[PDB]
A paper describes a structure:
Prior to their diversification, KAI2 underwent duplication resulting in KAI2A and KAI2B.
The PsKAI2B structure shares the canonical α/β hydrolase fold and comprises base and lid domains. Nonetheless, further structural comparative analyses have identified two residue alterations in positions 129 and 147 within the lid domain which appear to slightly alter the backbone atoms and generally distinguish legume KAI2 proteins from KAI2s in other species. PsKAI2B exhibits a structural arrangement that results in a larger volume of the hydrophobic pocket (125.4 A3) yet with a smaller entrance circumference (30.3 Å) than PsKAI2A (114.8 A3 and 33.6 Å, respectively). Further in silico docking experiments of (–)-GR24 with PsKAI2B resulted in a successful docking of the ligand that is completely buried in the pocket and positioned in a pre-hydrolysis orientation nearby the catalytic triad. Among these residues, L160/S190/M218 in PsKAI2A and the corresponding residues, M160/L190/L218 in PsKAI2B are of particular interest because of their functional implications in the pocket volume and solvent accessibility. Residue 190 (S190 in PsKAI2A and L190 in PsKAI2B) is positioned in helix αD4 and represents a major structural arrangement at the back of the ligand envelope.
Residue numbers in the entry: 1 to 270
Write the structure that this text describes.
């Protein structure tokens, strides 16, 4: 394998000519896509990869300076696309990966035919002019709990992030991938995400964006989907689903996979 391919656990599955890239969010890995991948293998070559810092990656590769902003993750994405010789792709970004792909597409819009965002937000912190869902005190509480007992935090946080039954298979899976991260890496990354502010780059986006989220998402109020739709600088469309949870492609695939497939297969009018 190539050096980038190996470092990110890259897989290229399927036999189609066109490319689709599936990019996961915090606390999980490329297995979050397991219910979607089987539906894509004839139409596409499906590119899966893990973000640096996920529990499936080598913690020795986690450069704290490199990843102190989302730009470091966007470089990694562009490096993968370059090594794999992608001409263009549909990019499906979950949670923070929606903004990572957005940043990458501003540097190389030719590589992105469309961006599909799942559970995305350009900013979590409130202020008197913008509702993202969180106050600084909420973050301080979260980070204090993470740092004081990481194992206990994973078990309490997973059911909140996934939503629904606390004993579900999806809660099981997510609690395990959370706890497979090195605690200092997880803490550092979650701080970086929570304090991010991508609002000012949305107007520069030049690739069509499909904005999908659960109607009940603990980290993404529905008004954020409308905010993305308003401020993205080219055509976009919003679909709020009748689901609960931040990883709905994992916890409610019977509802969510058809929605993603629809946005993969149909385009927004120019």
């Amino acid at each position: 394998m190539g050096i980038v391919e190996e470092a990110h656990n890259v897989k290229v599955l399927g036999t189609g000519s066109r490319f689709i890239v599936l990019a996961h969010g915090f606390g999980t890995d490329q297995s979050v896509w397991k219910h979607l991948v089987p539906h894509l293998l004839e139409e596409f070559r499906v590119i899966l990869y893990d973000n640096m810092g996920a529990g499936t990656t080598n913690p020795d590769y986690f450069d704290f300076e490199r990843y102190s902003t989302l730009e470091g993750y966007a470089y990694d994405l562009l490096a993968i696309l370059q090594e794999l010789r992608v001409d263009s792709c549909i990019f499906v970004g979950h949670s923070v990966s929606a903004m990572i792909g957005t940043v990458a597409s501003i540097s190389r819009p030719d590589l992105f035919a469309k961006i599909i965002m799942i559970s995305a937000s350009p900013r979590y912190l409130n202020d008197s002019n913008y509702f993202g869902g969180f106050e600084q005190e909420d973050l301080d509480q979260l980070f204090n709990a993470m740092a004081s007992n990481y194992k206990a935090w994973c078990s309490g946080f997973a059911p909140m992030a996934i939503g629904g039954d606390m004993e579900s298979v999806a809660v099981q899976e997510f609690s395990r991938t959370l706890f497979n991260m090195r605690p200092d890496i997880a803490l550092s990354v979650l701080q970086t995400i929570f304090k991010s502010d991508m609002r000012q780059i949305l107007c520069l986006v030049s690739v069509p964006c499909h904005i999908i989220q659960s109607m009940k998402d603990l980290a993404v109020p529905v008004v954020v989907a409308e905010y993305l739709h308003q401020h993205v600088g080219t055509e976009s469309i919003v679909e709020v689903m009748s689901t609960e949870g931040h990883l709905p492609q994992l916890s409610s695939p019977d509802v969510v996979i058809p929605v993603i497939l629809k946005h993969i297969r149909y385009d927004i009018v120019a």
